[PDB]
Design an enzyme around this catalytic site. Sequence first.
Site, PDB file in Angstrom:
ATOM      1  N   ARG A 182     -12.164 -18.559  63.544  1.00 17.38           N
ATOM      2  CA  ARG A 182     -12.872 -17.467  62.664  1.00 17.38           C
ATOM      3  C   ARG A 182     -13.444 -16.492  63.387  1.00 17.38           C
ATOM      4  NH1 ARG A 182     -15.871 -19.116  58.729  1.00 17.38           N
ATOM      5  NH2 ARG A 182     -18.051 -18.180  58.528  1.00 17.38           N
ATOM      6  N   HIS A 228      -8.143 -10.800  54.042  1.00 18.77           N
ATOM      7  CA  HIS A 228      -9.334 -11.230  54.313  1.00 18.77           C
ATOM      8  C   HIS A 228     -10.142 -11.122  52.909  1.00 18.77           C
ATOM      9  CE1 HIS A 228     -12.830 -11.627  56.836  1.00 18.77           C
ATOM     10  NE2 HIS A 228     -12.183 -12.093  57.766  1.00 18.77           N
ATOM     11  N   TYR A 272     -16.807   7.357  51.322  1.00 12.99           N
ATOM     12  CA  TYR A 272     -17.313   8.734  52.108  1.00 12.99           C
ATOM     13  C   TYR A 272     -16.849   8.975  53.338  1.00 12.99           C
ATOM     14  CZ  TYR A 272     -20.682   9.577  48.255  1.00 12.99           C
ATOM     15  OH  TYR A 272     -21.147   9.642  46.938  1.00 12.99           O
TER      16      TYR A 272
END
Lengths: 636, 636
Positions: A182, A228, A272
């Site tokens: 990982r 994920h 944003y």
Amino acid sequence: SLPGKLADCSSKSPEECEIFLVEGDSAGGSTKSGRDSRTQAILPLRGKILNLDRILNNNEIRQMITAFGTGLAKARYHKIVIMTDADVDGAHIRTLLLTFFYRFMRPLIEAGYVYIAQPPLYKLTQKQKYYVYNDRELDKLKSESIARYKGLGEMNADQLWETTMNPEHRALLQVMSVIVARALPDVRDGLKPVHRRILYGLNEQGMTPDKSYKKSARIVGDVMGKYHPHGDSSIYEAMVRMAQDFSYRYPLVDGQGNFGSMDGDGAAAMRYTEARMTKITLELLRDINKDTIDFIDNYDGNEREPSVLPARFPNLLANGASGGMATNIPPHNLTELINGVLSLSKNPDISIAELMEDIEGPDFPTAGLILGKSGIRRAYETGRGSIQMRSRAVIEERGGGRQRIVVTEIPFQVNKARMIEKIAELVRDKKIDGITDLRDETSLRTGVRVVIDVRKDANASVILNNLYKQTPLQTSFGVNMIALVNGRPKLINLKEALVHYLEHQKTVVRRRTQYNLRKAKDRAHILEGLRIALDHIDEIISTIRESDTDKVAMESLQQRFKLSEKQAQAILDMRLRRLTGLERDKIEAEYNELLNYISELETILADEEVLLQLVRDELTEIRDRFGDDRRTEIQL
Amino acid sequence: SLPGKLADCSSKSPEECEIFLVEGDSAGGSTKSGRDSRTQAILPLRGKILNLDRILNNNEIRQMITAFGTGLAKARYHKIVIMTDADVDGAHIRTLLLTFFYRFMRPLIEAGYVYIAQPPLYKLTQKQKYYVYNDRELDKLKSESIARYKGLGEMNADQLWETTMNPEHRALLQVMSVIVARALPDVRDGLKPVHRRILYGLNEQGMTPDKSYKKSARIVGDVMGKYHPHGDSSIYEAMVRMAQDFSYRYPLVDGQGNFGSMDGDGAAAMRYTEARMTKITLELLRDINKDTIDFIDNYDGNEREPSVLPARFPNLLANGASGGMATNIPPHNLTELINGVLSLSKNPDISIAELMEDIEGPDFPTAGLILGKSGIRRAYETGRGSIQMRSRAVIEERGGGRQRIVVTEIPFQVNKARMIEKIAELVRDKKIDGITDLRDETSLRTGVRVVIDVRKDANASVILNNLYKQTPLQTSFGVNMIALVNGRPKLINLKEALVHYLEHQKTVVRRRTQYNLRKAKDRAHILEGLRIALDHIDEIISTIRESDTDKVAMESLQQRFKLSEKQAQAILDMRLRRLTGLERDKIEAEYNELLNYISELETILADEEVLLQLVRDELTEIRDRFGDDRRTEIQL
Ligand SMILES: [Ca+2]
């Protein structure tokens, strides 16, 4: 008997009673639900509080003791079950707790009062599903899909009860591959799980450089739900990182908006900031859908994801890999790298010393200076070595004999603010004399610019050399070239890294040729049936309109015109509009070219070197379009 | 001159210099980049630190002062620009800061030293896009899509510079609809923005009750990226909430795994817990794709989302609405509600007092007791009233004259653990005598069970009545029926809530009939062309195979067989397989029925009451399948 924290049972005789230590969030509530409250009491531990980091007893642990009653044979519960998850996190608490018991409460272990929970392990869905507890039982089960339980919170109360805490059926016990894979990057594409998933989710949603920026949340949300399943933070951070000119030698993400700074300024909200693929990233996902890499199942089985990307440039070495820090690889020059790879391919037996005639050494996005070929050599020959990064600094003389230090580029990954904030301390702590002012005028137009005003009496040069010592103004890079080779974490040197890379490229190109070749045949076959079909159309319509069902239609067609199953099918799926005049020739034109193409592909496949050159050329082409000037200077 | 926190400029004459106060995450980094570091210095404020909540100066504010220099005409910067976002959050800091300046630094305001940033407001993408600063300029712009900048972090450095902080072009200024609509439920479906988006994302991914549970992350990730671009936490929490038997009278989510508890136990990780649609939720999204409600653009324009759901049951009143807490509506009985609605529809002029012959009053999932019709009346007549919720408690006599209190059901939304944890305090603080033991044996089998052991000398009954006073063991529910009516927040009473609801149902059903009717005609039209097409097939193939392009084909077909544009198209898209023998009759069979259907639909539409009954019946049907027994007892 802690009131608010612990759930109590009715029974009061320690012989009957049993206490489950579960992780609060893991399975606090569902564990409180499935229990037999007549004899079963639960104490959920606040995971966060527990965090070799020894210290004064925790409020959590202190509670654990109080509830037991011994902390003495005056114990309250004869059985003390430890329920924890299988996951990385889970084993933490399981060990911390066990480890603990030994140190201040061993009699319990000696007395066999502490047990360990054994929840199901596998559920085989074939609505009938199975409850297996170990591989052998599973192996026997399957011979007589799979989904491995790795969280207690996956189970309902009653199941948790029935399978794990109900004495009738339960099977108590008296008394790191995730961590690995990982984190470490695959040596083939340089990407680590989160990054690869991200770049893949960019590709799957077609957020190519030619189309407009998409809001960041639109990518975080997709990746998190499909590949994920963790906090948005982890994904957005990793995505931001790939978009920073000062973080990636070759940004893989193209961001719009506020994306942080060298000072550790944060990035704006994901709803944003906008992001899309970088043009170089297309070379990273090029041909991904032409059977060039093996796909695998996603965390929950509803999606498919790349175990690797084609990675048409040496990304591991190019962009580096970063760190606990199990690995630490530095960025390099793409031109140098590709040139090094081309040099490898001309002769397998090339020395690291020769590879280094192409690959000068690291090359940080932040530029700056490297202090010698020493650590570089060691790092390339062995995969480990300290490398000395020093800022680019000059001194300049001005007014009344006053001097000035101007820092133009800083060392990689050094937090500029913390460095400035540090020098300031060395001045208040009077450990540095001569600095009359220090400013950080770094902007977009001026670029990095830290300015240290030295006084007339002081010696700027001397001060400067004192910064290399007392501050991050010089930093070491500890190379440590570890990466996933053949599913296993391995340490590599320079040559080896490229070798596994070039190998991957030969695999990608061949695998692509093959895919392309078998996809063309498939289509050539289908075109032959269409030609036949169209030519004898009158017939085709006759035999079809005479057929009562689409199945007998299939039958007549294959029978009478000697079409294949696929071919007959295609003719039945033909639209009346394909009957127009121009079509027949397009079908013949497409065919005549397709035959030529099939030929050229078999030619590549047949010859070994022809393919290697294909790789040689494609690599050379990318180097030509993306390669740039080296930023970091290796001096001495 | 704060070193690490503030970015300094070269210039030293206060006349030239200007300091921007920006929100750190908002635009700290990009603001540091676009600036003119020769005269522009930036101080990013750590938003989190700043949070009417007055107190000792913040470390953040203290820094603000230090940097100014006055805190005196010894000021460092003549201009002090406040850059903050447009968003809710943004106005916070803008006001806090302004408000602040007045109180301890007014001379600056008096001196006109503090300005306020004016970033662009609109970008019109029609690659050419526009930079408008106010509606009027925009209105003139468009007359001579839109996307309103509501975050500084949306802008790059150079744009931020060019449009907002570059003196040549900048336009400084000397010196809550989101909050609203984003919380309050629509009075039509009871859902508030996050919930509706969630149930919609469940529908869009087809996570119906008949299909398997999908991992929670798979829904959080989808909603967050397409409809609700915020922390996973907000979405997962809201989704968990809809899945809790003790939170929703009619759970809208069907969860699997650990989903918390009345004690405020948390839910398991989103990648562990599974979730799918509840069967009642299907009645909530029924017909959503039959043009029954207006869709709108999603936050970024790439998706489409429901402004309301069909909501085929009175969900607002049914499941309630919860709280700052601008509104507070309690759950009710579905059978009672639907019956109340049916009573409304029989005569518009029905009194709240009569509605109440159906709707007994609130009905919490947690059961328990309500202490009188008083607060209920007031709440229903006006939309506001305190309602008294008391636990279900009994005392039972046992052994040596000892007594016992057994709490079976607790008041809605009361945190059971905190209540237990509280009684314990009242006992250590010796404010309660007689309690020899207290246990919370609440499990799945025993249900809620708090047991208080009273002693022989004490009076359990008396103690009990003392709990109603000193603990949450009795709690008030402050009704406050506020909801979005006609886009605006409005206070409603019982009748009004149902009225807007029933109205919505008449709109849904009619709008559905219409959609169905115009979709059938469309298809009937298309079938006529197919019949013609098939009948004279020989001809059709003749005129098509004679055509050189698909466009002239269109032309001949319409010309010769008098087909319509759509019809001609459909015939060209026909597959050869549709030529089989059985097809012609299916086309005729589908047609002959479709004509009958079109007829029946025009019949509903034509008659007002026929439609109202349709609503009457569909409502009655749902009440029959989902209605259940009342859990909360209104006594006295
Ligand atoms: Ca979070």
